[PDB]
């Protein structure tokens, strides 16, 4: 099915011919180059298990590569020899060593996160070949990081307005399934979000977690019964009340989310929920609340006006922090216009009008799982060290016009500092042992995963202070 | 392997219970809602063939869904009955009809592009079950569209500065493989780019084309031998000239791209290429030119200073439009900081300094295939028509705070206007036959692809004026 020989930037096919003659080692590292001051390291284990481990080279896959690349370049540039070596010598197991910080670890920017080097001098070319597939770890890293930053904002404001962080892990739902570029992207994105939260509408995210990480948590992911516009609008413009009444009665004993902005969000909250069907809401259990979903207008203005309306029609309490609280059978979900920037504006506006964050949970789609790029955290793979004619050489780029594109020199290691911070030691200075043990661990060697983490370990490592 | 029962927004599991009783039909449409004034319709055929066609329901997949959703909701909310019906009645073939504009069609914004309706009254729920997976067509649509807009800019400036569009389809390369969220996303993205251009470093893009569309073109995709920083830097800081000389000699008879900004782009062009190795460049064939790749600094400023340096060291001609032309053995690739916005700035700045666009080709990665979202063209799926108690009802949303989120009413059709423009007719007004035949065709019915397009047809349909 998958052919790792095809799974590279096609130009890398020619790179074995381009390295200095008598090169026995190519050593390369991945970092989130130097606001996202710290990144969550998550997703490498998925790639290692799915694509890189075991017998990944066959006679068929070498022949497929030869044909595919011959057409692509209109020239017989693909080299079977190096792949035939790996097939014959190691039964198609990749002779590379990958070291990495533990999955879920929170590491400041500008630090070595993983390194790759060949274990056989004949496979010097292989380190660079697998750059492309390993670099795609930027996505689960960037989703996990951006999601965790949104969790920080929710943590600050939930603690301020309620005095606790009860239910924090249910405050930001993944609605991104339709808004991402592929089914595979949806799975990886959902799992990266689930490092921080439990809410997703992509069950493939939980399947990815169970298969590639594993969990002792009986409920690692969840969702709630919810309406869409179609299940309201299908009743006709004049029968919105009938749609509401049908759905809350059909889901009387469980939580139900009901989109209320089909025609007039403010009419729906004040006249339909707040008057006509009030008796069907106030009778509902604390375990089975109505969640009103606005989905249009200015996100903050809409939330404030909805809470104002519900406050006028339902009994509002004031909690011990002096913040207004809706009854336990009634809540709101803001599933429109939420990203890292707007989330901050919304909880701040809610705090200024003395509404507890426990009143409103949040959802994000494209902004959560799609509107992220490799440049967000500057995720890149760079050659730092080579052995040529048996002599180690510390290598790096340093473009005269952009110092930010300078890469690190030589053999790298990651260390805790005395004050509890992080330092990446260059030029093999880790060997001086002036800091503790290297924080990177061998996770991959000669086609085998040597060190693995449960999703429980990932979540624990990725926790907030 | 893939389970379409799991491949929905998890809340849609409950929607069969939410539609009005006695609903026999759910009819829904996809549009790029109302700068991208026109969109390329591409990628639906990939989804229909990969995920939706044939026996997609089994006893095992129904049992998997029951278990997966029971945990996800902590409640037995998944309905086996509807799926057991489809299994027993249609041998697991989906009883839906999908109509769509031809693949590669260029359609203005705010027009019906495809429609979905159930063909069996028992499967009214199925239309909106498959929303999530069909909506993911936003990505190949948005990539194809954004790529075509970049082609328009290159077309304008290439014609202006050269007098022809020779090699236009090779002017923008896909470097996006590492910069996208998954391997599947890389394939789909590359194929969407290849609607407009032939340059990609993702061979999976060509494999997707051949398998899901097919082509009579012997060379639908291509790439060129190229260096990366690693194959230059590995030689050591003092041996940049040696790396250059080795690579151009190893690729003497083919085109070779050589990244030249490792240490000092301007030193490399003036002193290394322009003096030390000049004799190895000026001897090269028109079919095997050196391509210098800057990869840092202000994109426009760097390009202009590079061309100025090469102009001072190599013979420059002036073409019949009065624009400066490098010798046929020497060209430039700007593979850094290129997107729809900057591409315009670069070719404009090149034109103002009287440099032909023939001199410089372009490459884009994340900006091409990753930094795109569903909201770019406002791609959405909406229920427009239902039959309840045997009576047709025209349905729509109309949120009071956002008129732009208003959806279309009733049975839809797409028509050419007398002046050669497009109109979407609502409320079944297509039946009046004032505007000739509906442009949408049945592409899917009862688990079978009924209408298919070659990638040759897609490319022809997606052509510039
Ligand atoms: O309401 C739902 N899903 C439905 C849904 C459907 C669609 C959307 C939005 O609409 C967009 C789709 O529209 P277009 O296609 O773009 O036109 C989508 O991208 C997203 O932005 C949002 C939500 N889920 C849900 C989940 C958890 C909560 S809770 O955390 O409050 C809570 C948890 C547990 C117990 C009590 C409370 C509340 C609600
Ligand atoms: O030069 C190459 N590929 C190599 C390459 C490698 C990397 C890059 C850039 O670097 C990024 C990766 O770096 P980081 O990981 O972010 O640090 C990547 O995203 C991209 O931005 C760009 C290019 N190919 C190539 C293709 C076609 C032309 S042509 O159209 O001029 C032409 C066509 C036909 C005959 C003659 C001429 C010229 C050159």
Curated annotation (Swiss-Prot), chains A, B:
Q: What is its EC number?
A: 2.4.2.12
Please list the tissues where expression of this protein has been recorded.
Answer: Ubiquitously expressed in lymphoid and non-lymphoid tissues.
Q: What induces it, per record?
A: Expression shows a diurnal pattern of oscillation across the 24-hour light-dark cycle in liver, with a reduction in levels before the onset of the dark period (at protein level). Expression shows a diurnal pattern of oscillation in white adipose tissue (WAT), peaking at the beginning of the dark period. Up-regulated during polyclonal immune responses.
**Claim: ATP-binding is one of the keywords in the record:** no
The job of this chain, per UniProt, is described as:
The secreted form behaves both as a cytokine with immunomodulating properties and an adipokine with anti-diabetic properties, it has no enzymatic activity, partly because of lack of activation by ATP, which has a low level in extracellular space and plasma. Catalyzes the condensation of nicotinamide with 5-phosphoribosyl-1-pyrophosphate to yield nicotinamide mononucleotide, an intermediate in the biosynthesis of NAD. It is the rate limiting component in the mammalian NAD biosynthesis pathway. Plays a role in the modulation of circadian clock function.
Q: Name one Pfam family in it.
A: NAPRTase
Which key words tag this protein in UniProt? Answer: Acetylation, Biological rhythms, Cytokine, Cytoplasm, Glycosyltransferase, Nucleus, Phosphoprotein, Pyridine nucleotide biosynthesis, Secreted, Transferase
**Modification sites for Phosphotyrosine:** 170
Where does the source fall among the domains of life? Eukaryota
Q: What is its main location?
A: nucleus
Question: Family, per the entry?
Answer: Belongs to the NAPRTase family.
Q: Where in the cell is it found?
A: Nucleus; Cytoplasm; Secreted
Q: Which residues bind beta-nicotinamide D-ribonucleotide?
A: 201, 293-295, 335-336, 366, 374
Record the organism: Mus musculus (Mouse)
**Catalysed transformations (reactions):** beta-nicotinamide D-ribonucleotide + diphosphate = 5-phospho-alpha-D-ribose 1-diphosphate + nicotinamide + H(+)
- Subunit notes for this chain? Homodimer.
Provide one Gene Ontology cellular component. cytosol
Q: What is this protein called?
A: Nicotinamide phosphoribosyltransferase
The molecular function GO annotations come to:
cytokine activity; identical protein binding; nicotinamide phosphoribosyltransferase activity
Part of which pathway?
Answer: Cofactor biosynthesis; NAD(+) biosynthesis; nicotinamide D-ribonucleotide from 5-phospho-alpha-D-ribose 1-diphosphate and nicotinamide: step 1/1
